[PDB]
Ligand binder design. Sequence first.
Ligand SMILES: CCCCCCCC/C=C/CCCCCCCC(=O)OC[C@H](O)CO
Ligand SMILES: CCCCCCCC/C=C\CCCCCCCC(=O)OC[C@H](O)CO
Ligand SMILES: CCCCCCCC/C=C\CCCCCCCC(=O)OC[C@H](O)CO
Ligand SMILES: OC[C@H]1O[C@H](O)[C@H](O)[C@@H](O)[C@@H]1O
Length: 470
Amino acid sequence: MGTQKVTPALIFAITVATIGSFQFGYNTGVINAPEKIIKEFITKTLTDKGNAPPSEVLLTSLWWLSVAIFSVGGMIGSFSVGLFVNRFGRRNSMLIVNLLAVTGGCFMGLCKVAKSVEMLILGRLVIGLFCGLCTGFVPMYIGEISPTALRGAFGTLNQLGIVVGILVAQIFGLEFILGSEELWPLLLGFTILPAILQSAALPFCPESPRFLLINRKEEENAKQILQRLWGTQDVSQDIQEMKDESARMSQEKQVTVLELFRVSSYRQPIIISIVLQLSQQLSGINAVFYYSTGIFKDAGVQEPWYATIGAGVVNTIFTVVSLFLVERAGRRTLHMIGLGGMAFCSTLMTVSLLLKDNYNGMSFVCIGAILVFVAFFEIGPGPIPWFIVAELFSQGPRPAAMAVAGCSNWTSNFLVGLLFPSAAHYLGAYVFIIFTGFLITFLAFTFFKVPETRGRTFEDITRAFEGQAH
Ligand SMILES: CCCCCCCC/C=C/CCCCCCCC(=O)OC[C@H](O)CO
Ligand SMILES: CCCCCCCC/C=C\CCCCCCCC(=O)OC[C@H](O)CO
Ligand SMILES: CCCCCCCC/C=C\CCCCCCCC(=O)OC[C@H](O)CO
Ligand SMILES: OC[C@H]1O[C@H](O)[C@H](O)[C@@H](O)[C@@H]1O
């Protein structure tokens, strides 16, 4: 660490940033529990306005839209971060977009008294736009303000917020809390509250000193912010690394999305970045989490909702585990262990499901395979892809790279949700071998293609990619 310290100022800045991480997880998970309540609302709204009750095809379509419009907004929002972070800075970008969070949350809080299914859909679209921007803003901000030796650990706090957000959404979704016919608008409108908290706290967070020095050429301002955030007057190594990056950025054209696919020096890290996002989403994690309740039920769990909250607890615990390991073990090891362990668990889900009606006891194996699958996911493929893109690029290309990577994350998220019900319909229990195939494929890619970034400066990582490109 040299003289660099973890100050209360640093903890404060990063915690406040990860409120957007909490928003992404909360809004990802909140919609699942009140599904029947919300379909009832859709039917009652369509009839109360005169129309004939929806068929189940129509109800399913409108519910699918209510869920999926979120991912569409996330695809658009994540791809749009480059429009914000260089124009307003990283800190102010997070501040401004909470207008989206409050607006989207109000559309969802008010759709029932407005008797407006459109307002529900618009809300989920707006909150997806917000969350898409967040999933880009937060790791960029944390990656740019963390000490190098702790960039991975601090990067994992983003995923910690996501999984804490999911767990809170599951808990609030319990019917004796907010997941009731009366209170489900509050379950969705809750997202306004973190946003108000974060917006109150963000002015007191520092701008990224890398943004200030490199993008804005304010060396003295950056240096002062670094000295306070890290609790030391000696920041010469880091300042000089930033001046190196500033010199490099000055000598290369402004980076565009398309250019990331033309320049050889950028093509390797952007392929890595995109592939690592796929390895997260094409693990099937959101298919496994969402369908876990029905799988638990078919395995005999008498109260399957508490087993899914158990999965959410496991999801949180092993994010903390990854947090305390990623600087020791490094990115490669944790990510590969997660992919490999998930490969085993998804395969075991297929095997247990195929045998459980014949072999007494395999039901307990289905239950364990789901829970262990989630633990392995959070060892690496959960947290690492969200923060790794920030450390794979230097200052100039990072916003356009994270726009692309994040969009690929949301798009593959969408594609799993789009295609999984059909594949499960044809393949039954074999559907999880599809995720096994991706997991194994991406484990091979990781072992052969993903450099170790732990404890390395951005300049050192970028130089290695340029050396390879030569
Ligand atoms: C000033 C007026 C504000 C209005 C008052 C309403 C505030 C109530 C909000 C409660 C939930 C907030 C949850 C915020 C999310 C916590 C972030 C997190 O989970 O941390 C991630 C990781 O641990 C790295 O810190
Ligand atoms: C739980 C009561 C059962 C009755 C209602 C059945 C639906 C709930 C099923 C799983 C909840 C999982 C919540 C945790 C969040 C999972 C993460 C996720 O990806 O959500 C799925 C996707 O957003 C949208 O399909
Ligand atoms: C007839 C289809 C079922 C009715 C609607 C329920 C499905 C969720 C709706 C859109 C998925 C949006 C894509 C992003 C969602 C995350 C991936 C996911 O959750 O996959 C599981 C999903 O429930 C399915 O496979
Ligand atoms: O905890 C798992 C959640 O976080 C992951 O990093 C993904 O961003 C999200 O799709 C998933 O539902």
